[PDB]
RNA sequence: AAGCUCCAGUUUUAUGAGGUAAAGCGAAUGAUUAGAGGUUCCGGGGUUGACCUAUUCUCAAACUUUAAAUAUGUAAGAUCCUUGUUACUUAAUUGAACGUGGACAUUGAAGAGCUUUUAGUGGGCCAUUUUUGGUAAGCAGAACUGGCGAUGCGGGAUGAACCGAACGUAGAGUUAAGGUGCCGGAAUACACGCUCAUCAGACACCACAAAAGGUGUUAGUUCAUCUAGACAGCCGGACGGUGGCCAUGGAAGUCGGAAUCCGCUAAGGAGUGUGUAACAACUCACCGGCCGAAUGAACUAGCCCUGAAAAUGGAUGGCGCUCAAGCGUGUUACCUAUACUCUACCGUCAGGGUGCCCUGACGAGUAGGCAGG
RNA sequence: GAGAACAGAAAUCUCCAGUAGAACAAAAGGGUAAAAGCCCCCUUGAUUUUGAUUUUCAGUGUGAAUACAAACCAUGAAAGU
RNA sequence: GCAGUCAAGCGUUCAUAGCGACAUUGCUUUUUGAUUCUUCGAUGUCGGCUCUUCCUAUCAUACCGAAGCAGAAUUCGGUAA
């Protein structure tokens, strides 16, 4: 649903962006997202810290 | 002089040390002069300026500095004659070297005690020359470009830190430097 | 062994003041009196000569426990060891400076605290925090028993 | 294509920042990458290189990716390149024959790697710039390919299995 | 251990502080130095004006303070009101702030408080980071931390402290680190590129290899020259203003020291080197042809060799392959620990429940304490 | 720096310009301008008693210091010190 | 101890037949120091004799390069144990 407002607004957005540098003006999306954390790496060779 | 290669000196030893209270009777600066050639001349006559710049982080010996700079000077003053162009040494020699000086055999080892023991007795001066630092900045005219370049080549085999010859830009070039009057 | 241990050593950066702070201090600072429970930094001014703490104590924050004549009594905590005790320091007002951070902290919580009261009457912002604070608590409040509870972790078992 | 080579991800964004009448202005770097893992990274490295920012000050608005627009076929990519070897990074413009942007990456990597010194830590590049077939200048592999489009020359080049048959 | 009793941390806010680079103060090697006021001496000439010191604006880097440090670890620090009554230091004077008595209203999770008694020291070590001494050292001596000691097992040829990993038992599965030509699980894997020395099968390591680095090795870059014809070689041409001022025994193309125009014009420079005391030729410049397609100079990095010499016998662990079994770039699939998950179950502790049964978590161990046998 | 015969060591005295580069018995470094420096007077509190606490040392003494209150005086306008 | 680079310079003239400073990078482990790893319930010392095996940085012999090699004594240097 977030993505729809950008899509609706902009024809312009895509073509310019693949071909060259610069960015266009008018809108922008903020985002939240919660996280999950898994510990890959062990205790060996680290501070207690 | 007295041998030690520069295996002893070249890597970056010591919390400096060359502080003026803490060392009466250092052995001398042996560098004959820092600016050379036309000392009575501004930078601005010369359209060419050539530099010599380090690849490594070192302490260069005072003797190596004079030996490299005199070797360059004999090439300049023989080919361009006595009243040539103009050279400046970038780096003066003021880092002070300690080394312990040749014991004895008395079974007197170090007679000290066992020892050694700070307050080591000074062996002379070196210069810090860190990565990308410029040892010589030379001002010349393009019909003697070649002469300064071979003088800079004959300089390199007389210090151990690996260095590169380069053409300068600074502020400007030499002619965006000149339009305001 | 060798050399000293010593109060004055290692002071050169701490003792010394900026080009701007240099010159005689202003007697207003000397004049200032404080109340118990005020929060004060201790860091000695170089430009006062006497009243100075051990040098090692500077940059710590303490609470004015009591005063006895011109100098004031500050509680601060040091660090390291076993069953470390909190210390009283006699440290002058010239060397003691206010702390803004709690003052603005106090105003904000209190300014907030008025906004809430009206909300408690007619409004529901919260709700969960409301449930402990009516059921909760006297102490009276404001007591010296809470201080050893804080005192006890300062000697840290792990660090040791 | 199959299992990438580096589709360029057109990453866009902002900044997005503070209570001041400022704000950073609108940017692009279109960076060659494998997807979003790479996407993030490059942006922070670009933000280090040119810009300055932060991580937090750089805000990513959107992502749009890369397949084949134009032909598989036959740019001979002009690449602006930097290789890190026995000190830091030295400038390069390398114009080499390729199929495509997927390929370009591999052919350059193989060239930094082998020829130039390259190892891990690197990064990448600055730009890739298309060119007309006849224009292509430096030179070995491509000179033959330019000639091939020509043709006749495709009738040339036609060589590789050649010694094998009998006919 | 044995018991007693029922709080810990962290971003964020605020403080002040390591530091070390370019200014300021102080020191200052220590140049170069123009401009420019003034020292003080004599010494010559027609107030001026040669002669040495030396302010003053003014210029290459070092070092100890300090800004602003930039940093980064840090690094301490996170109830209110009213009423009465009492005190208080300080003009028979002004105030607060004390203490009471009474009422009113307010991202974390056992990491945890206290006591008695007990033991082994009270000789350490290595690595990482930051060092300090020392030429250095499998050195000395600090800091901050992990490991070894006291820690197995898997990797690394072996191998206290390197990587993975913290271990009750037993099994099945799947993995780490790291590896897949054979030894040797598991690929003679897939896309490509370089290398031909047997380089080379190597994180760290008693793993060596430098300055110098050639270099026409390969590659890359930067600047110039090319179909208007470069380039290797071979071939080939040159009249005239006029043998040019200064100086000197003497420069006259070519010892030193000037300007630099022009004829005509394939083209024919007041000249590239070879000369004699000096003059005294011949070539080249500049120009043309025979050929036809790229070209050379500067830097850089791989590779590589060159630098490259040692003692009882050859190795990268070994055999020893070289569009790889090298090395680098990407990439697919496999293999592989006591790990992790799970099954069963032994101790502790949560606890529950009826001398006994059950749930789930944690669970290597020297010195050593305690408790059961 | 200038100014004053003689005097160079030349105080000396004078005028200007002069913010911590001076002075402050003694290392070091820090620190301060009607100052804690310099001067003039007056004086004895370099008194006795007790010492909260820190440094000692995180709990361990002497010693040291920073603060008192009692006792006593000084100078000082007095506060105070 | 020996080597490499650079080559100031000397060699009548000529860097390099030969000699070669300053500087500078290495290598070896066979002098000397440094250390404190190993051994203080014990490693027999120097030196010499004699018997063996080795090394290459080669003094001679073999083959070669250069020369300031006329011969020729020679000098320097390569390969080589």
Swiss-Prot record, chain A:
Keywords: Cytoplasm, Ribonucleoprotein, Ribosomal protein. GO terms for biological process: cytoplasmic translation; maturation of LSU-rRNA; maturation of LSU-rRNA from tricistronic rRNA transcript (SSU-rRNA, 5.8S rRNA, LSU-rRNA); ribosomal large subunit biogenesis. Coiled coil: none annotated. It is found in: Cytoplasm. Component of the large ribosomal subunit (LSU). Mature yeast ribosomes consist of a small (40S) and a large (60S) subunit. The 40S small subunit contains 1 molecule of ribosomal RNA (18S rRNA) and 33 different proteins (encoded by 57 genes). The large 60S subunit contains 3 rRNA molecules (25S, 5.8S and 5S rRNA) and 46 different proteins (encoded by 81 genes). Component of the ribosome, a large ribonucleoprotein complex responsible for the synthesis of proteins in the cell. The small ribosomal subunit (SSU) binds messenger RNAs (mRNAs) and translates the encoded message by selecting cognate aminoacyl-transfer RNA (tRNA) molecules. The large subunit (LSU) contains the ribosomal catalytic site termed the peptidyl transferase center (PTC), which catalyzes the formation of peptide bonds, thereby polymerizing the amino acids delivered by tRNAs into a polypeptide chain. This is Large ribosomal subunit protein uL30A. It comes from Saccharomyces cerevisiae (strain ATCC 204508 / S288c). The gene is RPL7A. The chain holds residues 50 to 98 of 244 of the full protein.
From Swiss-Prot, chain B:
The chain holds residues 1 to 181 of 221 of the full protein. One of its GO terms (cellular component) is cytosolic large ribosomal subunit. Keywords: Cytoplasm, Isopeptide bond, Phosphoprotein, Repeat, Ribonucleoprotein, Ribosomal protein, Ubl conjugation. Component of the large ribosomal subunit (LSU). Mature yeast ribosomes consist of a small (40S) and a large (60S) subunit. The 40S small subunit contains 1 molecule of ribosomal RNA (18S rRNA) and 33 different proteins (encoded by 57 genes). The large 60S subunit contains 3 rRNA molecules (25S, 5.8S and 5S rRNA) and 46 different proteins (encoded by 81 genes). GO terms for molecular function: structural constituent of ribosome. This is Large ribosomal subunit protein uL16. The modification Phosphoserine is found at residue 143. GO terms for biological process: cytoplasmic translation; ribosomal large subunit assembly; translation; translational termination. Its main location: cytoplasm. It is found in: Cytoplasm. Belongs to the universal ribosomal protein uL16 family. The gene is RPL10. Sequence repeats lie at residues 167-181. There is a cross-link at residues 40, 101 (Glycyl lysine isopeptide (Lys-Gly) (interchain with G-Cter in ubiquitin)).
Swiss-Prot record, chain C:
GO terms for biological process: cytoplasmic translation. There is a cross-link at residue 32 (Glycyl lysine isopeptide (Lys-Gly) (interchain with G-Cter in ubiquitin)). It comes from the Eukaryota. Signal peptide: none annotated. It is found in: Cytoplasm. Belongs to the eukaryotic ribosomal protein eL21 family. This is Large ribosomal subunit protein eL21A. Keywords: Cytoplasm, Isopeptide bond, Ribonucleoprotein, Ribosomal protein, Ubl conjugation. One of its GO terms (cellular component) is cytosol. The lineage of its organism: Eukaryota, Fungi, Dikarya, Ascomycota, Saccharomycotina. Component of the large ribosomal subunit (LSU). Mature yeast ribosomes consist of a small (40S) and a large (60S) subunit. The 40S small subunit contains 1 molecule of ribosomal RNA (18S rRNA) and 33 different proteins (encoded by 57 genes). The large 60S subunit contains 3 rRNA molecules (25S, 5.8S and 5S rRNA) and 46 different proteins (encoded by 81 genes). Disulfide bonds: none annotated. GO terms for molecular function: structural constituent of ribosome. The gene is RPL21A. There are 2 genes for eL21 in yeast. Component of the ribosome, a large ribonucleoprotein complex responsible for the synthesis of proteins in the cell. The small ribosomal subunit (SSU) binds messenger RNAs (mRNAs) and translates the encoded message by selecting cognate aminoacyl-transfer RNA (tRNA) molecules. The large subunit (LSU) contains the ribosomal catalytic site termed the peptidyl transferase center (PTC), which catalyzes the formation of peptide bonds, thereby polymerizing the amino acids delivered by tRNAs into a polypeptide chain.
UniProtKB/Swiss-Prot annotation, chain D:
The keyword Mitochondrion does not apply. GO terms for molecular function: structural constituent of ribosome. It comes from the Eukaryota. GO terms for cellular component: cytosolic large ribosomal subunit. One of its GO terms (biological process) is cytoplasmic translation. Keywords: Ribonucleoprotein, Ribosomal protein. Belongs to the eukaryotic ribosomal protein eL20 family. This is Large ribosomal subunit protein eL20. The gene is RPL18A.
């Amino acid at each position: 649903a977030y993505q729809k407002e950008y899509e609706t607004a902009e024809r312009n957005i895509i073509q310019a962006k693949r071909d060259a540098k610069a960015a266009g003006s008018y809108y922008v999306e903020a985002q939240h997202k919660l996280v999950f954390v898994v510990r890959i790496k062990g205790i060996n060779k680290i501070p207690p810290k | 002089m007295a041998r030690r290669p520069a295996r002893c000196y070249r890597y970056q030893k010591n919390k400096p040390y060359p502080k003026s209270r803490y060392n009466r009777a250092v052995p001398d600066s042996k560098i004959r002069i820092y600016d050379l050639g036309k000392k009575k001349a501004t930078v601005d006559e010369f359209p060419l300026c050539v530099h010599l710049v380090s690849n490594e982080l070192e302490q260069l010996s005072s003797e190596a500095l004079e030996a490299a700079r005199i070797c360059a000077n004999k090439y300049m003053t023989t080919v361009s004659g006595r009243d040539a162009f103009h050279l400046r040494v970038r780096v003066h020699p003021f880092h002070v070297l300690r080394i312990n000086k040749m014991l004895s055999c008395a079974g007197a080892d170090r007679l000290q005690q066992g020892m050694r023991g700070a307050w080591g007795k000074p062996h002379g001066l070196a210069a810090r020359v860190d990565i990308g630092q410029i040892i010589f900045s030379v001002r010349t005219k393009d019909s003697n470009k070649d002469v300064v370049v071979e003088g800079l080549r004959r300089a390199r085999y007389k210090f151990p830190g690996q260095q590169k010859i380069i053409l300068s830009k600074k502020w400007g070039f030499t002619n965006l430097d000149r339009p305001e009057y | 062994m060798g050399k000293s241990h010593g109060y004055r050593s290692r002071t050169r950066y701490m003792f010394q003041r900026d080009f701007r702070k240099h010159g005689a201090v202003h007697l207003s600072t000397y004049l200032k009196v404080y109340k118990v429970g005020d929060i004060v930094d201790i860091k000695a001014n170089g430009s006062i000569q006497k009243g100075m703490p051990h040098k090692f104590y500077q940059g710590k924050t303490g609470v004015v426990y009591n005063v006895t004549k011109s100098s004031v009594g500050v509680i601060i905590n040091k660090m390291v060891g076993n069953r470390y005790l909190e210390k009283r320091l006699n440290l002058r007002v010239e060397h003691i400076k206010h702390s803004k951070c709690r003052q603005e902290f106090l105003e904000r919580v209190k300014a907030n605290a008025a906004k809430r009261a009206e909300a408690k009457a007619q409004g529901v912002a919260v709700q969960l925090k409301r449930q402990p604070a009516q059921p909760r608590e006297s102490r009276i409040v404001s007591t010296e028993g809470n201080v050893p509870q804080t005192l006890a972790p300062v000697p840290y078992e792990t660090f040791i | 294509m199959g299992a990438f080579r580096f589709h360029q991800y057109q990453v866009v964004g902002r900044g997005l920042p503070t209570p001041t009448d400022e704000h950073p202005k609108i940017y692009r770097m279109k960076l060659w990458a494998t997807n979003e893992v790479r996407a993030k990274s490059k942006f922070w490295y670009f933000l280090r290189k040119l810009k300055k920012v932060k991580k937090s000050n750089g805000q990513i608005l959107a992502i749009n990716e890369i397949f084949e627009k134009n032909p598989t076929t036959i740019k001979n990519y002009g690449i602006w390149l930097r290789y890190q070897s026995r000190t830091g990074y030295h400038n390069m413009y390398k114009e080499y024959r390729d199929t495509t942007l997927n390929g370009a990456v591999e052919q350059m990597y193989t060239e930094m790697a082998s020829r130039h010194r390259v190892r891990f830590p690197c990064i990448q590049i600055i730009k890739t710039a298309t060119v007309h077939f006849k224009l292509c200048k430096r030179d070995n592999t491509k000179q033959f390919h330019k000639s091939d489009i020509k043709f006749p020359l495709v009738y040339r080049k036609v060589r590789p299995p050649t010694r094998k048959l009998k006919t």
